[PDB]
Each structure stands twice: as C-alpha cells, then as structure tokens.
C-alpha cells in the first residue's frame, strides 16, 4: 500500500488571525518521507510554503511566510502540521501537503515536482 | 535565449544525427530539448540533467556509442570528454566497494573540470552500490547540479522493434531494473536496496527515458 495524505484545519479567518493545518498520513510510516506544504489560488502558480526533513531536524520556508508559519511533524502520530499565524489576504489559497521518500534524514524539497504523493487540499480564506 | 554552449552542443548533435540515421526522430528531438534546457538554465541550477537511454540486445553497440557521444556532445563547449563508468566492470563485486569506486570516479571528474558522465550498463551494478546515484541524481540535493549524467540500460530482450510508445518503453526499463536490482541485492552490505530506495532511485533517473535502435554500421564495435 502507498501512503495517503489527508489535510484538515482549513477555514475562514479575518486578517491577523491564525490557523493550524494538519495532515494525517495512512498506509506507511510518515517518518519515511520528507514533507512539504504548497498552496494555490485560482489561476495562479502553485507556490512552495514550507518543507521539513524526515528527522524534523531541517526546515525551510518561503520568504513571504518566514516568521509567521511553522512546519513541524509528529512522526509517532504520523501527522505533519503547519502553524499559520498573523495571516494576510495574500495567504488565501488551497493548501496541499505532499510527501516524498528520501534516504537522507536531513534532506528536504522545495519544488512540487520533487514530490510523489499529495493530499486533496484544504481551503484557507483570509478576509480583508 | 541560446548560448555558445548550446551552439557547440547542437553542432555535435547534428553530426551524430547525420552519422546515426537509424534512430527514432524523437530520440534526437527530446534529448536535445532536455539537455539544451539544462545548458541554458540560470544559475543556481536545482538538478543535474539525467538522461536514461535503453536498448535491446540487437542494439547493444548503438546504445554504447550514442550514449557516450551524446554525453561528450554536452561537454564539447568545455573541450573535455565525459567521465566514463561501466557497470559490466562492477557486477561480480562487493557492493560497498563498488560504491566507493563510482563515487571517487564521478567526484574526481566533476571536481576537476568535467561536466558530464556516461554510466554504461547501469543494470549491471550491484544493487546496493546504485545508492550512490542519490548523491548524484537527487531532485534537489545532488552534489553537482551543473552536470549531465547519461545512464544506459541494456535489456535482455532481443529487440524492441519500432512500434512501442515511450510509456511502454519506460515501463519495460523500470520493470527490468527492479528484477536486476532485486537479484543482485546483498542485504548484508552497508549500502543495500529496499523497495522504497529502489522506487526513489527510479523516480530520480526516469525524467527522460528514450530507446536506441540498432545501427548496422556499428556492428564493427567502433564508434562513428
């Protein structure tokens, strides 16, 4: 069985608020995978948001979300998170979690093309 | 926009097309598009150009010649030949030992002015040693992103014929490697294959998989 990703935690918030997205992995141990969050608004290019290595030891963020968002993972519960604070209208989009195997525990991936598995997405709407 | 590196590359590929007229047009079209894009891509690059060529037994000599000459064509602007590695030279051997050898050969070349390698007979490497291609072929964390690697896979089938589409050719190569690398896996090696590692390798080397057709002017075994 391949791994399956299911994102939750989306919703509507006024600018300044916060959301916590989670992605639950089933079928395989999540610790097998580097994980990334990406986002896409209608008609626009899908955008890298954050990524985290299998060990949790290495992360990287898009410049536009650094200091506001925090990616983290709980391999024991097979779940990954994206804490989104100080939200802005520019953050409105469908957010997707993606996973991809890598043999190195510190490697991460900031390009969507790197990732083999994706979730269904969760809408995040930030009102003005 | 087109560079002098690409013009030298096109000079050499045009010559190849003129020497080897028995190939699918898509071999030349798709490999040139793929490799030029890498040669034209802005710094920093995110990934090396990784081209996988395959052939059946009746095209063994074309596979060997065209893979090495396409790799040399990539490097022609640098007036150096591609690094040559050959898996038939490695098969009887301890996997961890082979891994050290391949790593030294590639790193020594790439650190010292060479920017392409041809990896002949990839299917014949001991399975665990092929983990070295995560270092060189990873999607974003490869050790040398400004280089090309042309890998070849020689199938055990006698012929491919000319009717196959690329998806079917790629499935053939994927399936064959899975058989070869399961067969030669040595779990007691420090570096050993497992299913996730095998699928991960496949994902990193299968960006562009193209078949090579027989060339009767090569049965000589001397490249044109």
Residue numbers in the entry:
A (entry chain a): 1 to 128
B (entry chain A): 360 to 583
What does the paper say about this structure?
Lamina-Associated Polypeptide 1 (LAP1) and Luminal domain-Like LAP1 (LULL1) are type II integral membrane proteins with ∼30 kDa luminal domains that share 62% identity. LAP1 localizes to the nuclear envelope (NE) via its lamin-interacting domain, whereas LULL1 is found throughout the endoplasmic reticulum (ER). LAP1 and LULL1 associate with Torsins, which are ER-resident members of the ATPases Associated with a variety of cellular Activities (AAA+ ATPases) superfamily.
The conserved luminal domain of LAP1 (aa356–583) was recombinantly expressed, purified, and set up for crystallization. Because the protein failed to yield crystals alone, we produced a camelid single domain (VHH) antibody fragment, VHH-BS1, against LAP1 as a crystallization chaperone. In the asymmetric unit we find two LAP1 molecules related by a non-crystallographic symmetry axis, each identically bound by one VHH. Like ASCE-type AAA+ proteins, such as ClpA, ClpB, and p97, LAP1 also has a central, five-stranded parallel β-sheet, surrounded on both sides by 10 helices in total. In contrast to canonical ASCE-type ATPases, LAP1 lacks a C-terminal domain. Instead, helix α1 is N-terminally extended compared to AAA+ ATPases, thereby sterically blocking the nucleotide-binding pocket. We note that VHH-BS1 binds to the area immediately surrounding the arginine finger of LAP1, thereby interfering with TorsinA binding.
